[PDB]
Amino acid sequence: DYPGPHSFDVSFQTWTYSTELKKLYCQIAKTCPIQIKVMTPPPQGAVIRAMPVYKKAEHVTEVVKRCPNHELSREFNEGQIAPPSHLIRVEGNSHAQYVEDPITGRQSVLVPYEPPQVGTEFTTVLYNFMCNSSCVGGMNRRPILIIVTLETRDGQVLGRRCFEARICACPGRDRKADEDSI
Amino acid sequence: SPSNTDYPGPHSFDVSFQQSSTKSATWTYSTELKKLYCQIAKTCPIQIKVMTPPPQGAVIRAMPVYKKAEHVTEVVKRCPNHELSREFNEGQIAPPSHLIRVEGNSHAQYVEDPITGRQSVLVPYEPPQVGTEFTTVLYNFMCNSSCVGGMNRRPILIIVTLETRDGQVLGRRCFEARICACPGRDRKADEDS
Amino acid sequence: DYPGPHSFDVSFQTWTYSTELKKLYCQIAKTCPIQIKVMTPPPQGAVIRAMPVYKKAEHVTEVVKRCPNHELSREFNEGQIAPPSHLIRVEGNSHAQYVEDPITGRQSVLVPYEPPQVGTEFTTVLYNFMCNSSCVGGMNRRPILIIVTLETRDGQVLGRRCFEARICACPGRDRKADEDSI
Amino acid sequence: SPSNTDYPGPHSFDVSFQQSSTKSATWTYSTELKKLYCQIAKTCPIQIKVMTPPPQGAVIRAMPVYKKAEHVTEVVKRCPNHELSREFNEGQIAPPSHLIRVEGNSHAQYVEDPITGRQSVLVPYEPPQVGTEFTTVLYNFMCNSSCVGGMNRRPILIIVTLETRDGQVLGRRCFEARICACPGRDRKADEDS
DNA sequence: AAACATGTTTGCAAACATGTTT
DNA sequence: AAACATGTTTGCAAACATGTTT
Ligand SMILES: [Zn+2]
Ligand SMILES: [Zn+2]
Ligand SMILES: [Zn+2]
Ligand SMILES: [Zn+2]
Which positions of A make up the binding site? 67, 70, 131, 135
Show the beta-strand stretches assigned E in chain C.
9-11, 15-18, 23-27, 31-37, 47-54, 88-90, 97-100, 107-112, 123-129, 144-151, 157-168
Q: Identify which of A52, A10, A12 has the alpha carbon closest to the alpha carbon of residue A32.
A: A12
Cα D51 to the center of its chain, rounded Å: 22
Please list, residue by residue across C89-107, b when 16 or more beta carbons sit within 10 angstroms of its beta carbon and e when fewer do.
Answer: bbeeeeebbbeeeeeeeeb
Given a contact cutoff of 8 angstroms between Cβ atoms, the answer to whether A158 and A57 are in contact is: no
The distance from CA D41 to its chain's CA centroid, rounded to whole angstroms, is 12
- Distances in Å between the Cα of D26 and the Cα atoms of A167, D16, D20, D136, D181 are 48, 17, 10, 17, 9
The count of C-alpha atoms lying within 13 angstroms of the C-alpha of D7, restricted to the half-sphere facing its C-beta, is 14
Q: Write C151-155 long-range contacts (CB < 8 A, 24+).
A: C151/C46, C151/C47, C151/C48, C151/C49, C151/C110, C152/C43, C152/C45, C152/C46, C153/C43, C153/C44, C153/C45, C153/C46, C153/C47, C154/C45
Q: How far apart are CA A122 and CA A116, in angstroms?
A: 5
* Chain A residues in contact with D72 (beta carbon < 8 A): 79
> Integer distance in angstroms from the first to the last C-alpha of chain C?
25
CA distance C139 to chain D (A): 12
| Torsion sign over Cα A76, A79, A82, A83 | positive
Q: Would the CA dihedral through B13, B15, B20, B22 be positive or negative?
A: negative
Do D7 and D165 touch, CB atoms closer than 8 A? Answer: no
Name the 3-class secondary structure at A174.
helix
Q: How far apart are the first and last CA of chain A?
A: 25
Which chain A residues have a beta carbon less than 8 Å from that of D70? Answer: 74, 78-79
Spatial distance between the Cα atoms of B158 and B102, rounded to a whole number of angstroms: 13
State how far the Cα of B109 lies from the Cα of B121, in Å rounded to an integer.
6
Q: Which of D158, D169, D185, D186 is nearest to D8 (CA)?
A: D169
Give the list of residues 6+ apart from residue D80 with CB closer than 8 angstroms, or none: C68, C69, C71, C72, C73, C137, D149, D150
Give dist(CA D168, CA C45) in Å, integer: 71
CA distance B33 to B14: 16
Instruction: Output the CA angle B177-B80-A107, nearest 5 degrees.
Output: 150
User: In chain C, whose CA is at the least distance from the CA of B72?
Assistant: C79
- Which ligand minimizes its atom distance to the CA of D141? 4
Render chain B in DSSP notation, one character per residue. ------B-TTTT-EEE---S----TTEEEETTTTEEEEETTSEEEEEEE-SS---SS-EEEEEEEESSTTTTTS--B--TTTTT-STTTSS--S-TTBSEEE-S-TT-EEEE-TTT--EEEEEE--PPPTT---EEEEEEE-S-TT-TTTTTT--EEEEEEEE-TTS-EEEEEEEEEEEES-HHHHHHHHHH-
Rounded distance, CA D100 to CA D140, Å? 6
Q: What is the DSSP letter of C20?
A: G
Per-residue flag: A165 CB under 7 A of strand F: no
Nucleotide nearest to B190 (CA to C1'): E17
D66-69 long-range Cβ contacts below 8 angstroms, 24+ apart: D66/D151, D66/D154, D66/D155, D66/D156, D66/D157, D67/D154, D67/D155, D67/D156, D67/D157, D67/D176, D68/A79, D68/D154, D68/D155, D69/A78, D69/A79, D69/A80
Q: Is C33 helix (H, G, I), strand (E, B) or coil?
A: strand
Chain C interface, mutation test: which of D97, D148, D151, most C Cβ atoms within 10 Å? D148
Strand E lies under 7 A from the Cβ of residue C170: yes
**Of A50, A40, A69, A71, nearest in space to A165 by CA:** A50
> Coil, strand or helix: which one is A74?
helix
Instruction: Give B28's strand partners.
Output: B37
Q: What is the rounded CA–CA span in Å between residue D100 and residue C77?
A: 30
In chain D, which residues are last before a break of more than 2.5 Å from C to the next N?
22
Is D182 (CB) below 7 Å from strand F? yes
Q: Name the E strands within D31-168.
A: 35-39, 43-49, 59-66, 100-102, 109-112, 119-124, 135-141, 156-163
Name the residue among D7, D176, D179, D150 with its Cα closest to residue D82. Answer: D150
In sequence order, the β-bridge partners of residue A53 are A145
User: In this structure, are residues D113 and D156 in contact, taking their beta carbons and an 8 Å threshold?
Assistant: no
Give, in order, the Cα–Cα distances in Å from A108 to each of A53, A98, A138, D94, D157.
10, 6, 16, 53, 34
Chain A touched by B81 (CB under 8 Å): yes
Closest-CA residue of chain B to A140: B81
Task: Evaluate the CA torsion angle C13, C15, C18, C21 in order and state its sign.
Answer: negative
Residue range C1-182, CATH number: 2.60.40.720
Calculate the CA C118 to chain-centre distance: 25
Residues of chain B with Cβ-Cβ distance to A66 below 8 Å are: none
B1-193: what fold? Immunoglobulin-like (2.60.40)
Burial (Cβ within 10 Å: 0-12, 13-18, ≥19) of residue D75: middle
Burial B77-89 (b: 16+ CB within 10 A, else e): bbbbbbbbbeebb
CA nearest to C50, candidates C167, C168, C160: C160
Class of residue C83 by CB neighbours under 10 A (exposed 0-12, middle 13-18, buried 19+)? middle
Count CA within 13 A, CB hemisphere, residue B53: 5
Burial environment of residue C177 by CB neighbours within 10 A (0 to 12, 13 to 18, 19 or more): exposed
Evaluate if the CB of B146 falls below 7 Å from strand E. yes
Longest distance between any two alpha carbons in chain C, whole Å: 45
Residues 32-71 of A with CB under 8 A from B: 67-69, 71
Name the amino acid, one letter, at A13: Q
Three-state SS for D186?
A: helix
CA distance C50 to C108: 6
Identify the experimental approach: X-ray
Closest chain B CA to residue A137: B81
Report the sign of the C-alpha dihedral through residues A164, A170, A176, A179, in that order: negative
Nucleotide nearest A135, CA–C1', reads F7
Give me the phi and psi of B125, to 5 degrees please. Answer: -75, 135
Q: How many residues does chain D have?
A: 193
Separation of alpha carbons A181 and A20, rounded Å: 14
Is B168 exposed, middle or buried (CB count within 10 Å of its CB: 0-12, 13-18, 19+)? exposed
Of C181, C180, C179, give the one whose Cα is nearest residue C23.
Answer: C179
Q: Quick one: which H or E segment has residue A180?
A: helix A171-180
The sheet with strand B109-112 has its strands ordered as: B27-30, B35-39, B169-180, B156-163, B59-66, B119-124, B109-112
CA distance D145 to D148: 9
Residue A164 Cβ < 7 Å to strand F: no
Task: Choose among C165, C169, C3: nearest CA to C88.
Answer: C165
Contacts of A16 (CB under 8 A, 6+ apart): A24, A25, A26, A171, A172, A175
Question: B96 CA to chain A: closest CA distance, Å?
Answer: 14
Local structure of residue D182 (DSSP, 8 states)? -
Give one DSSP letter per residue of A113-130, joined into a string. -----TT---EEEEEEE-
**HSE toward the beta carbon, residue B16, CA cutoff 13 A:** 12
Site from C76, C78, C80 to mutate, B interface, most B CB atoms within 10 angstroms: C78
